[PDB]
Amino acid sequence: RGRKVYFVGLNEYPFLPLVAGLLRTYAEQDERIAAAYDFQEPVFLVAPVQEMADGIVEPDVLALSCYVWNFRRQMKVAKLVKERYPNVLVVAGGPHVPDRPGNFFEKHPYVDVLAHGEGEVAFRELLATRLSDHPDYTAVPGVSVRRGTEAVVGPKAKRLPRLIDTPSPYLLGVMDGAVATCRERGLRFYALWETNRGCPYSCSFCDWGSATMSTLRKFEDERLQDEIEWFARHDVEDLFICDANFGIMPRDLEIAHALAEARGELGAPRQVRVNFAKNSNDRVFDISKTWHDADLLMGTTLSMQSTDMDVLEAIDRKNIGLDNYRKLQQRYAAENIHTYTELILGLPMETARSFRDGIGSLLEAGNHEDLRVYELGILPNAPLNTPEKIEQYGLRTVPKRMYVERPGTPDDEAETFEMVMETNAMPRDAWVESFSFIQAVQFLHNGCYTRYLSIFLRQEHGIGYTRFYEGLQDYFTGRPDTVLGALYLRMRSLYHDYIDMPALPLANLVASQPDMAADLAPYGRRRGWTIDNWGWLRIATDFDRFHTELREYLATLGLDARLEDVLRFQQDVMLRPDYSPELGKSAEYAHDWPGYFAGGLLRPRRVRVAYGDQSFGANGRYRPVPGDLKAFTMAAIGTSYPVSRMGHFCHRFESAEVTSL
Ligand code: B12
Ligand SMILES: CC(C)(CO)[C@@H](O)C(=O)NCCC(=O)NCCS[C@@H]1C[C@H]2CC(=O)N2[C@@H]1C(=O)O
Ligand SMILES: C[C@H]1O[C@@H](n2cnc3c(N)ncnc32)[C@H](O)[C@@H]1O
Ligand code: MET
Ligand code: SF4
Ligand SMILES: [K+]
Ligand SMILES: [K+]
């Protein structure tokens, strides 16, 4: 027995309950807490709200770890649990808890305590104070306490020191049950891991770890090494490191080598996801090379958010120079180390013009493989979320639902994301056009369908990358019956419905549309199809017509045997459903295109190219099977989550044999 403590921190994808384990093991250092409280297995997998609430039996404390993806459902769980147990202490923490609660407890009178920011100290003090004959919640630092419906702000939060020396839930065995649950249910999952806390920078849109603009604090060395071995010994294939700037600290290289050696010795992890440092440096490169050799790498972060000087000044971000970015791209490409760059659509002062020009400048600098875009969200505690900032830049938002809602689910259970869809610099019509533009760049250029053609036209015919993809959108949007035109127009109407119908889900957008879901059904059953997944597969379905219609657009540019030759190469290099790894795939060309796109001089040299790819995707785990459309989809585009941009879309030259004729 004892006072039962329930943790709830759910998400649609399985992530081990790190928060619950951290708070529990830190609090249990108090012998009174360890003796009096009976900590329950954390709830982290999604279930119907009523089922989840029914699973909480005689709770003394209900602890909710609240993010944008679970706030509404966890408030509903608390409401139902509070109804049945009037004396349960409901405490909510996490970055969706507002720093300034205001009228929070009027809207959520079933919540009793709000924890602000890092929660170890406050949670331990809460549980300790609850054991007293006269609990004094108004002395607990870093919390706000409900009195009636008023929020009584407690003393300022206390944080852990520069060297964080706290218990590890992994090493203490309290994460064993969560792994077992995932494995019992056959679920792929991520283990969460922190090596430090904080980001030293100040991007106004961001709320990373509730600790931007902060002095960095490190978890102790020995704990981290023990945890690396724990992950490896428990065959955790997928590791998610939460650091804001991996590579920013000298020891990050030693951590990277330790993970590579763990993979070599124990077979795990196989994939490590992490955000790499903003001010990318030699250490980031050394880490990426180490993980490339061990096949742990999921892509080196070289993110920009925006490239426009006024936008960056408005959001308090300094990027590396465009020429330094180009030099980085060359260095990584020479080692075949995958990089990626993120942009945010709708940032303060960003126009459709600057948005498209920035994208083109990134391709110009050498980013052809991985460009990612996110709709700007107003996070509760980001510096950008003030009435003054929103008014100054004219930010207009809609409460955007995140997921498709099963029929019969009450509307107060739908998670919402405060999404910007219009600014003073970007009207909503231009927002829609800009969103479609970069989606097309993703499935056409990153997706390879026109990447080599575009590079050839840029380097031999002076057709700029922005010009090329702007021309595609202008030309084909006026031609509704072409393959590409149908895609542009479907995206235009989708993204206008996306704004006008806040219920259309951010994370299941394709799946929410019956016609788009029907188009992808032969390729697989997924809730998480992305727009660029859908675009890539739609072209795969009508591949031959796509290329005949592409010729007509090329005529409008003033554009020949060499162009005819590179078009055949651009057609053959794409992965197709009939590809057989046993037989391979070969063709003959008037030029050595593999040598050219690897940096060589373009020469009229007749060559035979024989592609012999055996597998695709992360760790080469997807093997094509001719005629099997499901197997083709996995090899071509991988999983929708995690994002699959390494070893996909097209046949690779490293596996190709080029012989002279
Ligand atoms: C891993 C991760 C994910 C995972 C989900 C992880 C999960 N299910 O738990 C995935 C990859 C799915 C994800 C997605 C997104 N994410 Co994310 N993600 C993170 C990341 C890197 C780590 C979260 C984590 O576990 N941290 C480690 C834990 C230990 O720390 P913590 O969250 O700070 O917890 C402490 C305090 O909050 C407090 N606390 C927390 N819970 C509780 C509970 C109680 C009772 C108490 C007392 C205290 C308390 O104590 C903890 C320990 O000190 C964070 C950034 C970060 N470093 O925190 C962003 C972050 C959570 N993501 C964010 C965003 C915006 C998103 C997206 C929604 C949008 C995007 N990125 O473009 C997308 C999803 C979009 C879509 N669906 O298409 C924001 C969320 C802000 C918010 N208000 O929710 C963050 C903070 C990053 C940012 N940009 O500022 N995310
Ligand atoms: C089927 C679902 C879609 C639920 O209906 C389920 O599969 C799910 O919810 N899946 C997570 C999808 C997701 O969160 N996508 C966002 C893009 S990626 C994510 C954010 C980007 C920057 C950073 O650090 N990353 C993270 C990463 O790269 O992991
Ligand atoms: C980790 C990545 O998450 C993105 N990111 C961070 N904060 C936000 C936000 N408020 N809205 C959208 N995307 C965001 C940035 O592109 C960053 O590089
Ligand atoms: C975690 S955000 C992405 C990585 C890095 N901090 C950047 O902004 O470039
Ligand atoms: S975007 Fe990256 S650099 Fe900027 S505040 Fe967030 S974590 Fe720090
Ligand atoms: K803050
Ligand atoms: K260090």
Side-chain angles (χ1 to χ4, degrees):
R1 262 115 195 177
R3 295 171 182 257
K4 299 174 74 180
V5 180
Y6 286 87
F7 293 100
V8 181
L10 57 96
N11 203 352
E12 306 289 321
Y13 199 84
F15 281 83
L16 298 183
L18 175 63
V19 169
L22 289 171
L23 299 183
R24 166 182 169 176
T25 56
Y26 184 82
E28 281 183 322
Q29 295 179 291
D30 186 326
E31 287 177 344
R32 299 173 300 179
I33 291 178
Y37 289 99
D38 178 14
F39 291 92
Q40 305 297 298
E41 274 292 336
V43 179
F44 64 102
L45 300 178
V46 169
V49 169
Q50 188 64 58
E51 176 183 327
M52 293 189 41
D54 293 341
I56 300 167
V57 175
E58 296 185 354
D60 184 77
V61 178
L62 174 61
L64 309 171
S65 185
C66 295
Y67 302 77
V68 65
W69 57 74
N70 61 19
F71 173 74
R72 295 295 173 182
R73 284 174 286 185
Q74 288 179 177
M75 289 300 100
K76 190 63 166 298
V77 167
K79 185 182 187 178
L80 296 172
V81 171
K82 177 64 79 162
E83 289 174 9
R84 295 172 60 203
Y85 305 95
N87 305 317
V88 68
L89 179 68
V90 179
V91 49
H96 223 63
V97 170
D99 285 344
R100 294 167 301 275
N103 69 337
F104 184 96
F105 295 119
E106 288 182 9
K107 301 176 296 177
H108 310 283
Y110 38 83
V111 182
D112 300 311
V113 180
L114 300 180
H116 304 289
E118 183 189 82
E120 276 89 339
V121 173
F123 186 73
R124 173 175 173 174
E125 290 306 311
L126 274 177
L127 294 191
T129 288
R130 183 164 181 82
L131 300 183
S132 178
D133 284 340
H134 299 86
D136 184 7
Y137 294 111
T138 46
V140 176
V143 302
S144 298
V145 180
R146 182 184 59 79
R147 291 302 171 79
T149 60
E150 183 199 351
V152 181
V153 181
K156 290 295 188 182
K158 297 182 183 183
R159 67 186 175 207
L160 297 169
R162 176 195 66 92
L163 185 57
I164 306 172
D165 180 25
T166 59
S168 164
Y170 292 109
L171 303 182
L172 292 180
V174 313
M175 308 289 280
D176 295 350
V179 169
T181 294
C182 290
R183 293 184 177 287
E184 286 165 8
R185 302 183 187 188
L187 299 179
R188 189 176 182 181
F189 66 95
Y190 274 109
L192 287 162
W193 194 46
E194 299 183 297
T195 86
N196 53 51
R197 288 184 171 166
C199 173
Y201 309 116
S202 55
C203 305
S204 71
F205 58 78
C206 190
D207 195 21
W208 204 263
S210 309
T212 63
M213 310 186 289
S214 87
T215 300
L216 301 193
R217 298 171 296 143
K218 302 172 46 177
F219 281 93
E220 191 260 325
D221 288 350
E222 182 175 46
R223 178 230 187 103
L224 295 182
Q225 180 56 43
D226 287 347
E227 285 172 332
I228 289 172
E229 296 172 7
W230 190 98
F231 295 130
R233 288 180 192 150
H234 287 75
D235 191 38
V236 178
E237 300 184 353
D238 298 297
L239 185 57
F240 198 117
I241 307 186
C242 302
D243 295 8
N245 294 281
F246 201 68
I248 199 170
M249 292 189 187
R251 72 174 188 171
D252 293 352
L253 180 58
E254 302 169 51
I255 293 168
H257 279 285
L259 281 164
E261 288 157 21
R263 162 62 174 91
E265 169 191 327
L266 283 160
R270 298 168 75 190
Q271 293 285 84
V272 180
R273 182 76 172 99
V274 71
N275 286 273
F276 287 89
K278 182 169 69 62
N279 302 342
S280 200
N281 54 19
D282 284 350
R283 189 177 306 116
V284 168
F285 178 85
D286 295 340
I287 290 169
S288 303
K289 168 66 175 164
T290 303
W291 286 356
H292 169 69
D293 290 351
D295 210 8
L296 299 177
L297 178 66
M298 299 180 68
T300 303
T301 322
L302 300 172
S303 284
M304 291 285 175
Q305 325 303 357
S306 179
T307 71
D308 181 80
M309 184 183 62
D310 286 331
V311 176
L312 294 170
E313 199 276 340
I315 64 168
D316 292 315
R317 179 181 173 100
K318 176 185 293 183
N319 283 324
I320 68 174
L322 205 56
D323 196 65
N324 294 328
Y325 180 81
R326 177 194 60 83
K327 291 182 201 185
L328 282 181
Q329 296 289 352
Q330 294 182 330
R331 187 186 189 189
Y332 281 84
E335 302 287 344
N336 302 278
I337 298 177
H338 184 80
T339 71
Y340 71 100
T341 295
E342 296 157 315
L343 299 171
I344 300 178
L345 177 64
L347 291 165
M349 308 198 71
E350 188 100 64
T351 66
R353 177 75 265 158
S354 63
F355 186 72
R356 292 182 317 258
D357 287 338
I359 291 163
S361 70
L362 296 175
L363 273 62
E364 174 74 13
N367 184 345
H368 303 289
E369 295 186 347
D370 203 335
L371 183 67
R372 308 186 190 180
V373 64
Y374 312 109
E375 309 98 312
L376 173 59
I378 305 301
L379 306 178
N381 302 313
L384 187 60
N385 182 26
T386 75
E388 293 77 12
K389 284 294 176 192
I390 291 168
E391 164 68 23
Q392 173 184 3
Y393 300 111
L395 308 181
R396 308 289 307 276
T397 66
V398 298
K400 169 56 59 186
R401 286 197 175 181
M402 296 203 64
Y403 310 113
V404 286
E405 299 297 336
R406 299 176 164 98
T409 300
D411 303 312
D412 66 349
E413 291 180 13
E415 311 295 352
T416 62
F417 180 84
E418 183 159 9
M419 180 187 79
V420 173
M421 34 61 60
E422 177 163 274
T423 75
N424 287 339
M426 186 175 287
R428 68 192 63 193
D429 285 355
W431 185 88
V432 167
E433 299 300 301
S434 300
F435 215 171
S436 310
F437 174 81
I438 188 168
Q439 295 292 7
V441 173
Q442 285 171 82
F443 59 75
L444 295 175
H445 202 80
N446 297 167
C448 300
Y449 280 115
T450 64
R451 184 206 298 175
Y452 296 117
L453 172 62
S454 178
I455 294 170
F456 168 78
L457 293 181
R458 161 70 184 91
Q459 297 179 349
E460 308 306 320
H461 290 267
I463 303 291
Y465 294 110
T466 301
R467 171 69 177 93
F468 182 80
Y469 287 103
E470 271 182 5
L472 279 172
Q473 185 174 22
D474 291 341
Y475 180 83
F476 280 104
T477 301
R479 303 183 160 67
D481 294 320
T482 59
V483 175
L484 195 53
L487 300 179
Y488 279 118
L489 290 173
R490 186 60 181 94
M491 286 190 292
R492 183 179 79 185
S493 62
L494 173 66
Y495 282 132
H496 275 106
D497 291 347
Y498 192 55
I499 291 172
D500 298 331
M501 307 159 202
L504 286 190
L506 180 143
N508 311 140
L509 187 52
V510 171
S512 74
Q513 305 294 289
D515 62 316
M516 302 176 70
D519 285 339
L520 306 185
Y523 295 107
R525 173 180 289 101
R526 305 189 187 183
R527 285 290 176 82
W529 290 118
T530 71
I531 284 296
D532 72 296
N533 296 157
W534 163 84
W536 199 97
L537 290 174
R538 288 302 290 155
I539 296 172
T541 299
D542 295 311
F543 182 75
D544 285 339
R545 180 156 73 88
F546 172 85
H547 272 282
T548 59
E549 295 164 345
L550 181 61
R551 298 171 63 89
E552 299 172 330
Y553 168 68
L554 295 180
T556 75
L557 306 177
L559 300 164
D560 183 12
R562 188 176 69 173
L563 179 57
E564 207 71 270
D565 198 46
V566 76
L567 282 173
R568 282 178 50 250
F569 175 80
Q570 177 67 97
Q571 294 167 19
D572 299 335
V573 78
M574 302 303 304
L575 182 60
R576 300 295 291 146
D578 64 352
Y579 175 71
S580 163
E582 306 178 29
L583 299 175
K585 176 187 200 176
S586 69
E588 298 174 348
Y589 307 106
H591 306 74
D592 182 8
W593 294 115
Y596 168 72
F597 291 113
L601 296 186
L602 188 50
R603 281 298 183 272
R605 170 188 167 197
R606 279 169 42 249
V607 295
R608 180 184 179 263
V609 177
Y611 298 116
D613 308 75
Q614 296 304 300
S615 60
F616 292 85
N619 308 113
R621 70 181 69 191
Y622 302 119
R623 186 198 179 69
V625 177
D628 186 349
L629 283 179
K630 283 71 192 308
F632 164 74
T633 305
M634 300 311 302
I637 68 169
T639 57
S640 294
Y641 184 79
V643 176
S644 305
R645 296 268 174 96
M646 292 177 58
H648 281 295
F649 310 122
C650 62
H651 300 277
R652 293 179 303 269
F653 310 149
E654 301 86 8
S655 180
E657 191 187 346
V658 176
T659 59
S660 295
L661 296 177

mmCIF file with all atom_site columns, all heavy atoms in Angstrom, residues 99 207 210-213 381 383, ligand 6:
data_model
loop_
_atom_site.group_PDB
_atom_site.id
_atom_site.type_symbol
_atom_site.label_atom_id
_atom_site.label_alt_id
_atom_site.label_comp_id
_atom_site.label_asym_id
_atom_site.label_entity_id
_atom_site.label_seq_id
_atom_site.pdbx_PDB_ins_code
_atom_site.Cartn_x
_atom_site.Cartn_y
_atom_site.Cartn_z
_atom_site.occupancy
_atom_site.B_iso_or_equiv
_atom_site.pdbx_formal_charge
_atom_site.auth_seq_id
_atom_site.auth_comp_id
_atom_site.auth_asym_id
_atom_site.auth_atom_id
_atom_site.pdbx_PDB_model_num
ATOM   1  N N   . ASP A 1 99  ? 3.766  29.987 -17.743 1.00 0.00 ? 99  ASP A N   1
ATOM   2  C CA  . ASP A 1 99  ? 4.575  30.666 -16.733 1.00 0.00 ? 99  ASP A CA  1
ATOM   3  C C   . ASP A 1 99  ? 3.730  31.633 -15.918 1.00 0.00 ? 99  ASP A C   1
ATOM   4  O O   . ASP A 1 99  ? 3.928  31.776 -14.705 1.00 0.00 ? 99  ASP A O   1
ATOM   5  C CB  . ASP A 1 99  ? 5.729  31.421 -17.393 1.00 0.00 ? 99  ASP A CB  1
ATOM   6  C CG  . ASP A 1 99  ? 6.847  30.506 -17.853 1.00 0.00 ? 99  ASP A CG  1
ATOM   7  O OD1 . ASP A 1 99  ? 6.892  29.341 -17.410 1.00 0.00 ? 99  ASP A OD1 1
ATOM   8  O OD2 . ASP A 1 99  ? 7.680  30.958 -18.666 1.00 0.00 ? 99  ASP A OD2 1
ATOM   9  N N   . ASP A 1 207 ? 11.174 27.291 -27.174 1.00 0.00 ? 207 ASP A N   1
ATOM   10 C CA  . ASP A 1 207 ? 11.080 27.092 -25.730 1.00 0.00 ? 207 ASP A CA  1
ATOM   11 C C   . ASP A 1 207 ? 11.790 25.804 -25.333 1.00 0.00 ? 207 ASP A C   1
ATOM   12 O O   . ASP A 1 207 ? 11.327 25.058 -24.462 1.00 0.00 ? 207 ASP A O   1
ATOM   13 C CB  . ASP A 1 207 ? 9.619  27.080 -25.267 1.00 0.00 ? 207 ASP A CB  1
ATOM   14 C CG  . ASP A 1 207 ? 9.482  27.240 -23.763 1.00 0.00 ? 207 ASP A CG  1
ATOM   15 O OD1 . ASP A 1 207 ? 10.435 27.750 -23.135 1.00 0.00 ? 207 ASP A OD1 1
ATOM   16 O OD2 . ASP A 1 207 ? 8.428  26.852 -23.206 1.00 0.00 ? 207 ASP A OD2 1
ATOM   17 N N   . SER A 1 210 ? 12.265 24.377 -21.841 1.00 0.00 ? 210 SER A N   1
ATOM   18 C CA  . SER A 1 210 ? 11.918 25.479 -20.945 1.00 0.00 ? 210 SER A CA  1
ATOM   19 C C   . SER A 1 210 ? 13.175 26.165 -20.418 1.00 0.00 ? 210 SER A C   1
ATOM   20 O O   . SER A 1 210 ? 13.209 26.635 -19.277 1.00 0.00 ? 210 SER A O   1
ATOM   21 C CB  . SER A 1 210 ? 11.045 25.001 -19.780 1.00 0.00 ? 210 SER A CB  1
ATOM   22 O OG  . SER A 1 210 ? 9.934  24.253 -20.245 1.00 0.00 ? 210 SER A OG  1
ATOM   23 N N   . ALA A 1 211 ? 14.220 26.229 -21.248 1.00 0.00 ? 211 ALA A N   1
ATOM   24 C CA  . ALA A 1 211 ? 15.527 26.668 -20.773 1.00 0.00 ? 211 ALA A CA  1
ATOM   25 C C   . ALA A 1 211 ? 16.356 27.255 -21.911 1.00 0.00 ? 211 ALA A C   1
ATOM   26 O O   . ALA A 1 211 ? 17.556 26.982 -22.025 1.00 0.00 ? 211 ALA A O   1
ATOM   27 C CB  . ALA A 1 211 ? 16.291 25.521 -20.104 1.00 0.00 ? 211 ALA A CB  1
ATOM   28 N N   . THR A 1 212 ? 15.733 28.062 -22.770 1.00 0.00 ? 212 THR A N   1
ATOM   29 C CA  . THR A 1 212 ? 16.547 28.869 -23.670 1.00 0.00 ? 212 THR A CA  1
ATOM   30 C C   . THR A 1 212 ? 17.158 30.036 -22.893 1.00 0.00 ? 212 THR A C   1
ATOM   31 O O   . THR A 1 212 ? 16.804 30.301 -21.742 1.00 0.00 ? 212 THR A O   1
ATOM   32 C CB  . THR A 1 212 ? 15.719 29.384 -24.845 1.00 0.00 ? 212 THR A CB  1
ATOM   33 O OG1 . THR A 1 212 ? 14.689 30.253 -24.358 1.00 0.00 ? 212 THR A OG1 1
ATOM   34 C CG2 . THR A 1 212 ? 15.078 28.217 -25.605 1.00 0.00 ? 212 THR A CG2 1
ATOM   35 N N   . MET A 1 213 ? 18.102 30.725 -23.533 1.00 0.00 ? 213 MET A N   1
ATOM   36 C CA  . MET A 1 213 ? 18.790 31.869 -22.931 1.00 0.00 ? 213 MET A CA  1
ATOM   37 C C   . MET A 1 213 ? 19.346 31.519 -21.553 1.00 0.00 ? 213 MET A C   1
ATOM   38 O O   . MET A 1 213 ? 19.254 32.304 -20.607 1.00 0.00 ? 213 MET A O   1
ATOM   39 C CB  . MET A 1 213 ? 17.865 33.090 -22.836 1.00 0.00 ? 213 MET A CB  1
ATOM   40 C CG  . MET A 1 213 ? 17.153 33.443 -24.127 1.00 0.00 ? 213 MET A CG  1
ATOM   41 S SD  . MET A 1 213 ? 16.205 34.985 -24.052 1.00 0.00 ? 213 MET A SD  1
ATOM   42 C CE  . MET A 1 213 ? 14.847 34.526 -22.987 1.00 0.00 ? 213 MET A CE  1
ATOM   43 N N   . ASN A 1 381 ? 5.222  29.476 -23.489 1.00 0.00 ? 381 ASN A N   1
ATOM   44 C CA  . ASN A 1 381 ? 6.264  30.190 -22.763 1.00 0.00 ? 381 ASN A CA  1
ATOM   45 C C   . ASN A 1 381 ? 7.416  30.642 -23.652 1.00 0.00 ? 381 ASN A C   1
ATOM   46 O O   . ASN A 1 381 ? 8.465  31.042 -23.136 1.00 0.00 ? 381 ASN A O   1
ATOM   47 C CB  . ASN A 1 381 ? 6.767  29.321 -21.607 1.00 0.00 ? 381 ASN A CB  1
ATOM   48 C CG  . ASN A 1 381 ? 5.647  28.936 -20.659 1.00 0.00 ? 381 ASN A CG  1
ATOM   49 O OD1 . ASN A 1 381 ? 4.840  29.785 -20.259 1.00 0.00 ? 381 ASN A OD1 1
ATOM   50 N ND2 . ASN A 1 381 ? 5.572  27.653 -20.313 1.00 0.00 ? 381 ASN A ND2 1
ATOM   51 N N   . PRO A 1 383 ? 9.400  33.358 -25.839 1.00 0.00 ? 383 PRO A N   1
ATOM   52 C CA  . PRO A 1 383 ? 9.429  34.832 -25.803 1.00 0.00 ? 383 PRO A CA  1
ATOM   53 C C   . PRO A 1 383 ? 8.519  35.475 -26.834 1.00 0.00 ? 383 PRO A C   1
ATOM   54 O O   . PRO A 1 383 ? 8.030  36.593 -26.614 1.00 0.00 ? 383 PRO A O   1
ATOM   55 C CB  . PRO A 1 383 ? 10.902 35.160 -26.077 1.00 0.00 ? 383 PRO A CB  1
ATOM   56 C CG  . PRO A 1 383 ? 11.653 33.940 -25.617 1.00 0.00 ? 383 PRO A CG  1
ATOM   57 C CD  . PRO A 1 383 ? 10.753 32.772 -25.913 1.00 0.00 ? 383 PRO A CD  1
HETATM 58 K K   . K   B 2 .   ? 12.069 30.660 -20.571 1.00 0.00 ? 6   K   B K   1
#
